[PDB]
Design an enzyme around this catalytic site. Structure first.
Site, PDB file in Angstrom:
ATOM      1  N   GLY A 123       4.179   9.872   6.691  1.00  0.00           N
ATOM      2  CA  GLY A 123       4.723  10.814   5.864  1.00  0.00           C
ATOM      3  C   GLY A 123       5.701  11.926   6.251  1.00  0.00           C
ATOM      4  N   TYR A 162       5.924   9.305  12.350  1.00  0.00           N
ATOM      5  CA  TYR A 162       6.766   8.729  11.101  1.00  0.00           C
ATOM      6  C   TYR A 162       5.590   9.072   9.927  1.00  0.00           C
ATOM      7  CZ  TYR A 162      10.195   7.222  14.241  1.00  0.00           C
ATOM      8  OH  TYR A 162      11.290   7.132  14.822  1.00  0.00           O
ATOM      9  N   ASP A 191       3.339  -1.515   1.066  1.00  0.00           N
ATOM     10  CA  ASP A 191       2.239  -0.934   1.030  1.00  0.00           C
ATOM     11  C   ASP A 191       0.830  -1.581   1.716  1.00  0.00           C
ATOM     12  OD1 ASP A 191       4.220   1.104  -0.092  1.00  0.00           O
ATOM     13  OD2 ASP A 191       2.638   1.550  -1.749  1.00  0.00           O
ATOM     14  N   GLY A 251       8.212  10.279   8.537  1.00  0.00           N
ATOM     15  CA  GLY A 251       9.007   9.721   9.190  1.00  0.00           C
ATOM     16  C   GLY A 251      10.687   9.839   9.094  1.00  0.00           C
ATOM     17  N   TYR A 311       3.444  -0.108  -9.023  1.00  0.00           N
ATOM     18  CA  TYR A 311       2.844  -2.031  -9.252  1.00  0.00           C
ATOM     19  C   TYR A 311       1.505  -2.501  -9.566  1.00  0.00           C
ATOM     20  CZ  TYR A 311       1.607  -0.050  -4.406  1.00  0.00           C
ATOM     21  OH  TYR A 311       0.846   0.810  -3.230  1.00  0.00           O
ATOM     22  N   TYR A 339      10.051   0.048   3.417  1.00  0.00           N
ATOM     23  CA  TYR A 339      10.690   0.905   2.132  1.00  0.00           C
ATOM     24  C   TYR A 339      12.577   1.139   2.301  1.00  0.00           C
ATOM     25  CZ  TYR A 339       6.402   2.833   0.695  1.00  0.00           C
ATOM     26  OH  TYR A 339       5.256   2.902  -0.257  1.00  0.00           O
ATOM     27  N   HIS A 373       6.335   0.713   7.780  1.00  0.00           N
ATOM     28  CA  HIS A 373       6.247   1.027   6.471  1.00  0.00           C
ATOM     29  C   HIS A 373       7.615   1.672   5.721  1.00  0.00           C
ATOM     30  CE1 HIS A 373       4.975   3.526   3.066  1.00  0.00           C
ATOM     31  NE2 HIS A 373       4.136   2.208   2.488  1.00  0.00           N
ATOM     32  N   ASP A 374       8.334   2.314   6.847  1.00  0.00           N
ATOM     33  CA  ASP A 374       9.422   3.194   6.577  1.00  0.00           C
ATOM     34  C   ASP A 374      10.638   2.119   6.780  1.00  0.00           C
ATOM     35  OD1 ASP A 374       7.955   5.509   6.709  1.00  0.00           O
ATOM     36  OD2 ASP A 374       9.096   6.018   8.363  1.00  0.00           O
TER      37      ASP A 374
END
Lengths: 4, 121
Positions: B29, B27, B89, B31, B64, B51, B47-48
């Site tokens: 870079g 996952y 993040d 995933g 951001y 998003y 994290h995936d």
């Protein structure tokens, strides 16, 4: 764009 | 943005996002499928998903702002997308820090065929  | 995430990762862990986390496990870079290989890969899985909660945001490019309050990451107010991207993040960078104790170089450049099956967020 999200992660899937 | 991806570049800002990479800087956050380096600040947090002392590892360069490329190559330490750009091709790690199933996952990180890139995933998509498989059972995450370890806790670090689970950081990327989540994290995936994070998003994925933001289909009308553009986390690769949208920038951001954040600051440090004595080590702590504090996301500063931008657009709604920017705020939510920053929180995703931040969580991942903290997760990578929390799991450095089990990071394994054997999972760098992990081959796609060993990552099979969908895992729901």
């Amino acid at each position: 764009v999200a992660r899937s | 943005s991806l570049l800002e995430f990479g800087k956050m990762i380096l600040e947090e862990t002392g590892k360069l996002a490329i190559p330490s986390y750009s091709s790690y496990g199933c996952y990180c870079g890139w995933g998509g499928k498989g059972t995450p290989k370890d806790a670090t890969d689970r950081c990327c899985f989540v994290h995936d998903c994070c998003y994925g909660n933001l289909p009308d945001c553009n986390p690769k490019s949208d920038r951001y702002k954040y600051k440090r309050v004595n080590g702590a990451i504090v996301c500063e107010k931008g657009t709604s997308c920017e705020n939510r991207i920053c929180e995703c993040d931040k969580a991942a960078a903290i997760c990578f820090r929390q799991n450095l104790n089990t990071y394994s170089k054997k999972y760098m450049l992990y081959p796609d065929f060993l990552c099979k099956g969908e895992l729901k967020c």
